[PDB]
RNA sequence: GGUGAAAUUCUUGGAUUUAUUGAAGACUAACUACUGCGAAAGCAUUUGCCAAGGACGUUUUC
RNA sequence: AUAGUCUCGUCAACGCUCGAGAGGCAGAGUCUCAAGGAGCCUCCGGGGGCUGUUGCCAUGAUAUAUAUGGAUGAGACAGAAGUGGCCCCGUUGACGAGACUUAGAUUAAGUAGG
């Protein structure tokens, strides 16, 4: 019963974000249509996924959906034979859901944020200790978050430990392990290997 | 992935655990590989943005089951299963602790009271 | 099968519905139906499908209503507006029955697809000038068979499937579906010897020797059905020469195959087995004719003078 | 022991010790096969096949031991799959 | 609906509004029944048919 | 009543047996078990509530 | 060699209802809509009639919304999901691919050998 219970509840949960995705993507496409109407040029997909990030960072309503029209009205978002002519309306289609799919890849950057609002709007409906995180400071270590993604976690554990990286311990021993790792041929030899 | 971090920062600010965190963000981006983003690479990646975590993730959930036997034993006085599991797990988050106190990720001065 | 189709699916998903509920290699249908329009619909099965180009163009028969907008003064003068209407699409038309007070009336037409009769409709509301619009449509006649013509519906045919499928009578089934002679009644006769029906099915012109009967009427370049003395369609043709050349002459081509119907090998090959072909054959084998089997040197002029290729 | 079982039966007449049986499945039964619980426990054998051919019955002679009031409605009964005949094979040829 | 008709003498369907004729035969209903490819009802059909001979080819 | 045979006790005021009512404490007959669970102690009536586990897989700021 | 027939995939032209969607059909789940209510009168607590060409629900469809329909149904979830459940115009000509023949239609009592 439990388990029939929380596959419910799962079902559910699933349905309602479904739900919110569906209507945040088709008023978000029709915003996008009218603006296009309006400005009568393209819009570049890059200026789309930023007027998307500044709605979701907006927390968009109907009444904010039309501050968002208003924003578009702005300066800077507005500055930002007859088989031929229905390949050519094909082909524009093909753009339209290009541009849809792009609303798609924005909404899947902000899917955390969809789901954070979805639980808000569930916890809203229902009506009803902790982990801290100490400041330490930041070492970049001459790797950014993209080619640390790009290499595997058991080389990432060899080049430099977690003990060895411990924030409470004595600044002496990090900066001696920082000027040791920072070696410019060892950099240069991990990345052409 | 800026904003990959900056979202992993924000979910540390609501006092996350890391591998709820790295599950969360695995879930959001749809990593088929788990071997891309670990729980080592999101330490890292908080150690590069200057966040370290208070307290240690298995202590924390140590100490989440010792409250959580705490109310039960407050709830019902009368059982003494959970009294005597209480005291084992009390015994092995104190030898946690001592090790931690000696790896010197968690500070010394803090100590566990029942 | 003639079969009455719903008012809910259109044309194409009930013959696709057909041949899920038959098990069919393939189906079609010559007239198409709009989902709202229900009636008659002509349902070819596997090699009755050949006969759906053929069935092309074929005339239909509707029966539909119009809704008047507003009351007539004048009741006649729709007829009358009707007869305005029919003739040069709608060919021939009749006002079957009016109702003023319920602003409706049901009328028989003679046209060619179900969009023209809306647009009858509403020709009908602007000419009477009160409105109009159409309530309902059913066609009457799809081609050669009619309503009349033992129509069946979808679950006629669910039903004799089921029959066949548990109980193994085969009399509903055979009762539902009709032969697809049905759709060469009107078509002009020429019956064909046993022995030339596999040659004709292989694409052989018929000939001479092949012919036992021929349909009095018959013209130059018409359409006509080869059939055999069971009555069964070997395929449908185009006529070479007329009823008094077919008389007169003794030696000439009379049809070339338009479509085959038959299956191929359901007649065994009985062609080469002569006296013209095998002294034709003899002489190939000799060599008083070449291989391809053209007039050579050492032909002899007798041959020559009696035989003339019509190829 | 069978090494697959297929749901052969379902329960409904326990008439004369014996198990009368709807016919779940789309095949034929061998005469006198094992039938078992999903357990692959052996409870009977095949007596009789009846029924016509879009509702077919089948009924299972009882084991020693077995008794046919014990069971209840809805209950199965399974068959290994090597004891199976195709319906077409009874049908006459054409 | 409103589309309604009667056999006539000679086997043929007539076409009228009213739902009782002149001589007081009650009209059919032209239209025929909806259809769906996952009616799971032919043998209750075919069965009650079958009692009172009403199955074409019986 | 019980014993190998006994014996102590209860009473024609009713011992004992049978039937009913009320109260008290205890237990869950067969299935049932040195192959289940638990660190041991020990553990099978129904119904809920609470907390925690065993074996397996994915692994771990290990 | 030539020619024909059958089963197919592409191009061009010509007509039509102008042809792949936020589409339709079929199916599953939930919800809403049926004068099942209320008030008047009556005839013998019950029955009949009226308010009631009313109210409830759906539809602007070449469209009278004072309208047209309502279980032999309609609408919302659903611009969703699903399609590995189905459907989405015909004619002519050319090209290409896999094939079968290249056919003059015999026999008024048989076939194969010595």
């Known amino acids: 019963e439990k388990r029939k219970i929380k596959e419910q509840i799962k079902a559910e949960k699933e349905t309602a974000l479904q739900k919110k995705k569906t209507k945040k993507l088709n008023k978000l496409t029709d915003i996008l249509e009218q603006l296009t109407k309006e400005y009568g040029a393209e819009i570049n997909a890059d200026m789309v996924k930023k007027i998307t990030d500044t709605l979701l960072k907006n927390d968009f309503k109907e009444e904010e959906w039309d501050n968002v029209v208003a924003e578009l009205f702005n300066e800077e978002f507005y500055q930002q034979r007859k088989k031929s002519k229905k390949e050519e309306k094909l082909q524009k289609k093909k753009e339209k859901r290009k541009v849809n799919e792009l609303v798609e890849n924005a909404l899947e950057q902000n899917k955390l944020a969809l789901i954070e609002e979805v639980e808000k709007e569930e916890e809203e409906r229902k009506s009803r200790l902790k982990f801290r995180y100490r400041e330490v400071s930041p070492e970049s270590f001459g790797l950014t978050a993209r080619e640390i993604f790009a290499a595997d976690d058991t080389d990432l554990n060899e080049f430099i430990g977690l003990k060895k990286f411990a924030p409470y311990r004595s600044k002496e021993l990090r900066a001696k392990d920082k000027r040791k790792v920072m070696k410019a041929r060892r950099l240069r030899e991990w990345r052409k290997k | 992935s800026e904003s990959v971090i900056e979202q992993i920062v924000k979910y540390a600010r609501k006092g996350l655990t890391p591998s709820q965190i790295g599950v969360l963000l695995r879930d959001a981006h749809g990593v088929t590989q788990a071997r891309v983003i670990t729980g080592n690479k999101i330490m890292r990646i908080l150690k590069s943005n200057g966040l370290a975590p208070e307290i240690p993730e298995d202590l924390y959930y140590l100490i989440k089951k010792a409250v959580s036997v705490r109310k039960h034993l407050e709830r019902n006085r009368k059982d003494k299963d959970a009294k005597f599991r209480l005291i084992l797990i009390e015994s092995r988050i104190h030898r946690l602790a001592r090790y931690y106190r000696t790896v010197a990720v968690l500070p010394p001065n803090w100590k566990y009271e029942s | 099968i003639n079969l009455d189709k719903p008012s809910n699916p259109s044309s194409h998903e009930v013959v696709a519905w057909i041949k899920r509920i038959l098990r069919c290699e393939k189906t079609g249908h010559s007239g198409t139906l709009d989902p709202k329009v229900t009636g008659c619909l002509i349902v070819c099965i596997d090699r009755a499908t050949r006969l759906v180009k053929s069935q092309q163009g074929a005339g239909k028969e509707y029966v539909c209503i119009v809704r008047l907008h507003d009351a007539l003064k004048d009741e006649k003068d729709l007829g009358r507006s009707l007869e305005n209407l029919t003739g040069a699409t709608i060919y021939e038309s009749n006002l079957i029955e009016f109702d003023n007070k319920r602003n409706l009336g049901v009328f028989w037409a003679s046209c060619e697809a179900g969009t023209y009769m809306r647009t009858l409709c509403v020709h009908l509301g602007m000419l009477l000038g009160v409105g109009g619009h159409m309530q309902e449509l059913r066609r009457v006649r799809s081609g050669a068979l009619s309503e009349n013509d033992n129509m069946v519906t979808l679950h006629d045919v669910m039903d004799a499937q089921w029959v066949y499928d548990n109980t193994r009578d085969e009399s509903y089934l055979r009762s539902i579906i009709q032969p697809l002679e049905t759709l060469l009644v009107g078509y002009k006769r020429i019956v064909v010897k046993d022995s030339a029906v596999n040659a004709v099915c292989y694409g052989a012109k018929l000939m001479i020797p092949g012919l036992l009967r021929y349909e009095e009427g018959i013209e130059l370049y018409d359409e006509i059905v080869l059939i055999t003395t069971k009555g069964e369609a070997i395929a449908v043709a185009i006529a070479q020469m007329s009823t008094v050349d077919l008389a007169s002459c003794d030696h000439g081509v009379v049809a070339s195959v338009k479509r085959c119907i038959m299956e191929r090998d359901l007649y065994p090959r009985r062609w080469g087995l002569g006296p013209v072909a095998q002294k034709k054959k003899q002489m190939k084998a000799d060599g008083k004719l070449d291989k391809y089997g053209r007039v050579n040197e050492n032909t002899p002029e007798q041959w020559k003078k009696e035989y003339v290729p019509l190829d | ?94 | 609906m409103h589309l309604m008709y009667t056999l006539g003498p000679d086997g043929k369907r007539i076409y009228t509004l009213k739902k009782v004729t002149e001589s007081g035969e009650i009209t059919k209903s032209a239209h025929p029944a909806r259809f769906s490819p996952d009616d799971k009802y032919s043998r209750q059909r075919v069965t009650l048919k079958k009692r009172f001979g009403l199955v074409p080819g019986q």
């Not at chain 4, 297929?6 to 329960?11: D, I, Q, T, V, W």
């Open chain 4, 1 to 94: 022991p069978p090494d697959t079982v297929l749901e052969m039966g379902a329960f409904l007449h326990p008439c004369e010790g014996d198990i009368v049986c709807r016919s779940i499945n789309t095949k034929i039964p061998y005469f006198n096969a094992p039938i078992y619980l999903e357990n692959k426990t052996q409870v009977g054998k095949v007596d009789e096949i009846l029924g016509p051919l879009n509702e077919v019955f089948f009924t299972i002679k009882c084991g020693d031991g077995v008794q046919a009031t014990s069971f209840k409605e809805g209950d199965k009964f399974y068959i290994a799959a090597d004891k199976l005949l195709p319906i077409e094979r009874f049908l006459p040829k054409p």
